[PDB]
Amino acid sequence: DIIIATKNGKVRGMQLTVFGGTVTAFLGIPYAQPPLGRLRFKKPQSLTKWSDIWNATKYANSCCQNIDQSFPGFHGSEMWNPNTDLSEDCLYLNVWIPAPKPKNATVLIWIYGGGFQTGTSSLHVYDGKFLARVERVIVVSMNYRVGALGFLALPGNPEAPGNMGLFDQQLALQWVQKNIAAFGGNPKSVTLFGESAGAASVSLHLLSPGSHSLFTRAILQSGSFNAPWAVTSLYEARNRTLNLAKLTGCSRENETEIIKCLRNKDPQEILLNEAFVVPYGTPLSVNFGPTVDGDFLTDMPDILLELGQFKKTQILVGVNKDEGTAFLVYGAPGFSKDNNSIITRKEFQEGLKIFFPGVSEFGKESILFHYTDWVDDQRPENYREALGDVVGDYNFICPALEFTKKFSEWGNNAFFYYFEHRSSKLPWPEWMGVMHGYEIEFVFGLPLERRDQYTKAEEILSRSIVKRWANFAKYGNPQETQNQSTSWPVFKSTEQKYLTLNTESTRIMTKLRAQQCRFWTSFFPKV
Amino acid sequence: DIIIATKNGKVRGMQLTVFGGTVTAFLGIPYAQPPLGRLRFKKPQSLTKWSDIWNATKYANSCCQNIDQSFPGFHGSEMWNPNTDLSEDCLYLNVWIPAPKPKNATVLIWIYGGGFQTGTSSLHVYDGKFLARVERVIVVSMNYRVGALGFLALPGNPEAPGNMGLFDQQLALQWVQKNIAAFGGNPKSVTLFGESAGAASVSLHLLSPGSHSLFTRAILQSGSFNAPWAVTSLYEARNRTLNLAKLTGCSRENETEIIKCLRNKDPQEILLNEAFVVPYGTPLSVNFGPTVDGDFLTDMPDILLELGQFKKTQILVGVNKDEGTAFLVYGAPGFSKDNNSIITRKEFQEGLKIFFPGVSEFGKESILFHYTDWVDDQRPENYREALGDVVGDYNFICPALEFTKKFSEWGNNAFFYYFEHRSSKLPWPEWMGVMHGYEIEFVFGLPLERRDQYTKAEEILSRSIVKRWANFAKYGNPQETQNQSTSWPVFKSTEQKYLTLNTESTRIMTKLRAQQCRFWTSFFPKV
């Protein structure tokens, strides 16, 4: 029986057997008042205290969200859907600690992605018990509000100020600062890690002055806030909140009255209307996301980044080889997960209209010009591959590389990786390659479980990544020092060294996607 | 009708149509007295002059040599066998010039490989008409004596001084210095290029004071004189000449008498006994090769290299990804070109005894230790691949990299490549990969001929390599400047940048085979 006294009252955890050892899991500890009734769309309010023992022995409710129903019955998409009940009452977090209880362990805090519209901390691929067992770190993860309920903004109105889900994340970081030592953790050694919108969130904690003293360092897997889907302008945010009011019968002349009417709607009516607040969207649309609220975020984040106004610390950033392919089967014409998706030039063109809907004809022709000068045979897959690369370079890889360059120019060590291993169990088809999201299970150590039929080469790859990530959290340096491994060099402007992650051989390379990123970074923003 | 006046008399060439243009070929011009009767085993004597017109309209005799009969009827091995009559009368060279005749063209002089035991300039894959047509350079190639007839040595005795075939090469370089301007060539812009023993030969011309004023720069494809098969010690050379005498009935007390008796033997009796002058050999045995003769080579070449005593100029050096695989089917047990050659550990061990016959048990165990610590699954091909890498790293790649490091430390620009494209027409099986010898046809531009069924991607690769090699010869810098190509950086000690050559994407990488070469270069020589 493991019972821990926190600042809000006692919590009871449970013992898990993991690889011949034990891990103690405390699943579903509350970290804020449930944001119901009058609290809907406000910043999270802090917890009052319980007398008695809170049983943290099962995952809590996931936050309200739309679900992906594009492939019912299919593991490749269903594994990202929420696996506990959906509820507005969803502000909880999970703690995994080594047994015996550690003395001052480094803490890894995971922030899930999902476009800021979806996601939950309870998915199988985010289970922190392997990292706790193998590296003797404490792993923490939280649920945070998503969609309009997390990110609706009428900027400057404290009834719906924006960024509520980022404030939920921040309050969970505060919870670790105040309580993690009772679990054996060191509040002075806390690394954030997250993937896609979870990575963009981590990068915004580097910018937010209220997060500055709540963590030590940061890991960004496939995402950063300069990615084109990550931050909503003030103008589109007010537009979208007003469209949402229109669609739900809540248009009013007084803005505080709009919010009060939105607070009377059942969650389902809000969720049903979210897709439509925008005149056209894409597979990557973030309808309700982070905004410049003058609170969490004090200025446009591209200005803060450019002028060095962010926490000075080490970062670990990287991307997967085929980031853009997952998105093509959610609307590009000619694509299917159930065939080889060979498309024509005309299809490629229609595909750019799907992913770049507000963009000029010239802008879309510029994309086609840059990506279709082929090397070289008339390969059938030319256009299929070009579209996946357009979408992955624009939305993920070039923005991660630009973020890492700009961050590292202010004097801190940064380490960049390119993940290029396709999981032997991947249920999506071969043409999609090394997809977005599919490094996560290697990071959390799932291939360390021999019972699961990953290959031996994947066990070794995951074991090495897990060690590099734990060394980065503990020591700021993501080396694997014992097994004659390739040394991971810092990423600097000028040389731009990165490390490739694969089952065969790790290589130091330079200037990832140089010619493509010059296009997206220096030309495309003009268009 | 094209007739050119040389210093020895007139020669008549022939016109070839190549890609909608014309090339003039002068095949089979003599450059020395035929080395017959009393001249057998002596240095080549210079030509006397003919009155009348020498018809250089067909390839000349190849020098006497044993032939590869291991796979009769098989193109993969037969393409390297000689395709003109074998004769002691074989000191001729070929000249290809652009039409119309150029004004002061750069000259590329090809030196074929063949272990110093075999080879000829007339093979299809060395046909210089494509380079002359496309890059408007003059290409020259020579036959040089091989085997005992080229390299027998009784060191210091001018009846058989050693290095005769290197002196044949040198006299052909002298011939170009004196005559190439009559063909439109520039004698001040002459680049040597060669592969395997042809590359080792080129590297020895960099060391030989009599070659210094005969060329400008050098290209070394898969070979250098520090490779373990390239130079015979004085002691094994005298041993081998004496064994040859024993086997032919020519043992005498007076050494000049041994030579005179060897001069009475028919060539065939000499060729038949060459395999046996050594108590055991390997697939890579060079029984009669370059020696330290105090003439061509004034000291041990490792000393000259180490102390900077060589021509100061630019070099282009490189190797193929699977250099060692071709040799495994000429005697390693379990290997066959007609199956996947999966071998066991015991086979791997027997295989080291085949390739390292004079080496201690400890030495052979050290090889096995270094190459069999696997990453990682129990892959069936582990031992098959390890053997190909042992043989290719020891015999070709580590010595090319060490040569390039040591050369470049004295201040000259060097450029290193790693060739990693397997020809779509390769008649050897897939497990042999990117074999030794199979970059040659890309260098000479054979895939530029669309009629030959190489792929389009191979046409473009060859076109780019041909341009880099011609730019290196003409300008000392192997760039392809017009097609947004990767820039080829100089190879320096410290960084050791090299350029990968492939059909997909060219990359700049660093420290090729670092861990393996430390083994072969700093440890193995001790054993």
Ligand SMILES: *[C@@H]1O[C@H](CO[C@H]2O[C@@H](C)[C@@H](O)[C@@H](O)[C@@H]2O)[C@@H](O[C@@H]2O[C@H](CO)[C@@H](O)[C@H](O)[C@H]2NC(C)=O)[C@H](O)[C@H]1NC(C)=O
């Ligand atoms: C690969 O599939 C796509 C997707 O559409 C299909 O899914 C298939 C596996 C099959 O069940 C099919 O019936 C289903 O419609 C094909 O594109 C579709 O092609 C149809 C029929 O020609 C068009 O009229 C559709 O609009 C188009 N759908 C979409 C979303 O674009 C595609 O041609 C096929 N590609 C192959 C076989 O290479």
Ligand SMILES: *[C@@H]1O[C@H](CO[C@H]2O[C@@H](C)[C@@H](O)[C@@H](O)[C@@H]2O)[C@@H](O[C@@H]2O[C@H](CO)[C@@H](O)[C@H](O)[C@H]2NC(C)=O)[C@H](O)[C@H]1NC(C)=O
């Ligand atoms: C691949 O072939 C080798 C080579 O030997 C063979 O060539 C084959 C394609 C076939 O025609 C065969 O009859 C011929 O002998 C095999 O190694 C040989 O195996 C034999 C029979 O067991 C041994 O007794 C031989 O000594 C050995 N030869 C040599 C040179 O080592 C090899 O086993 C086979 N490998 C496979 C199928 O994976």
Ligand SMILES: *[C@H]1O[C@H](CO[C@H]2O[C@@H](C)[C@@H](O)[C@@H](O)[C@@H]2O)[C@@H](O[C@@H]2O[C@H](CO)[C@@H](O)[C@H](O)[C@H]2NC(C)=O)[C@H](O)[C@H]1NC(C)=O
């Ligand atoms: C935000 O403001 C308007 C909102 O118009 C919308 O009405 C909402 C309630 C919702 O249903 C939404 O889908 C609908 O679009 C946008 O006006 C649109 O602009 C288009 C032309 O692109 C016109 O056709 C309409 O006025 C309207 N669209 C449709 C499909 O009827 C406006 O575009 C937007 N502001 C932005 C994008 O900055």
Ligand SMILES: *[C@H]1O[C@H](CO[C@H]2O[C@@H](C)[C@@H](O)[C@@H](O)[C@@H]2O)[C@@H](O[C@@H]2O[C@H](CO)[C@@H](O)[C@H](O)[C@H]2NC(C)=O)[C@H](O)[C@H]1NC(C)=O
């Ligand atoms: C060079 O000198 C002798 C030469 O011995 C050889 O006689 C030749 C005419 C020829 O047929 C050759 O194959 C034969 O080996 C070498 O002596 C050998 O050493 C071995 C032991 O390894 C003994 O068994 C024999 O004396 C002889 N070999 C055989 C197979 O009979 C000597 O090794 C060599 N010098 C070197 C390698 O430096």
Ligand SMILES: *[C@@H]1O[C@H](CO)[C@@H](O)[C@H](O)[C@H]1NC(C)=O
């Ligand atoms: C907490 O845990 C134990 C179950 O072992 C139980 O005695 C106690 O009542 C629990 N509290 C609940 C279910 O509310």
Ligand SMILES: *[C@@H]1O[C@H](CO)[C@@H](O)[C@H](O)[C@H]1NC(C)=O
């Ligand atoms: C944990 O280590 C920190 C430094 O990282 C130190 O300041 C703190 O007091 C430690 N607490 C322990 C060992 O209980």
Ligand SMILES: *[C@@H]1O[C@H](CO)[C@@H](O)[C@H](O)[C@H]1NC(C)=O
């Ligand atoms: C609008 O209504 C709110 C809600 O009661 C009220 O408090 C506020 O003072 C009013 N504001 C304006 C600008 O009219």
Ligand SMILES: *[C@@H]1O[C@H](CO)[C@@H](O)[C@H](O)[C@H]1NC(C)=O
């Ligand atoms: C290092 O190698 C050992 C055994 O050689 C292995 O069991 C372990 O998984 C490796 N450790 C890491 C951190 O990769």
Ligand SMILES: *[C@@H]1O[C@H](CO)[C@@H](O)[C@H](O)[C@H]1NC(C)=O
């Ligand atoms: C050289 O060439 C021509 C063939 O066109 C001929 O007239 C001449 O006799 C030739 N010399 C020979 C064959 O020796």
Ligand SMILES: *[C@@H]1O[C@H](CO)[C@@H](O)[C@H](O)[C@H]1NC(C)=O
């Ligand atoms: C060829 O160029 C060289 C320099 O490389 C020059 O010295 C020589 O005289 C030239 N001859 C010509 C153009 O005929």
Ligand SMILES: *[C@@H]1O[C@H](CO)[C@@H](O)[C@H](O)[C@H]1NC(C)=O
């Ligand atoms: C050996 O014979 C040669 C050949 O005629 C002769 O010229 C030479 O002087 C003799 N040399 C010795 C060392 O006896």
Ligand SMILES: *[C@@H]1O[C@H](CO)[C@@H](O)[C@H](O)[C@H]1NC(C)=O
């Ligand atoms: C450069 O590109 C052109 C056409 O775009 C092509 O035809 C030519 O083969 C290329 N040249 C080289 C030297 O690679």
Ligand SMILES: [Cl-]
């Ligand atoms: Cl078009």
Ligand SMILES: [Cl-]
């Ligand atoms: Cl670079």
Ligand SMILES: [Cl-]
């Ligand atoms: Cl053993």
Ligand SMILES: [Cl-]
């Ligand atoms: Cl390096």
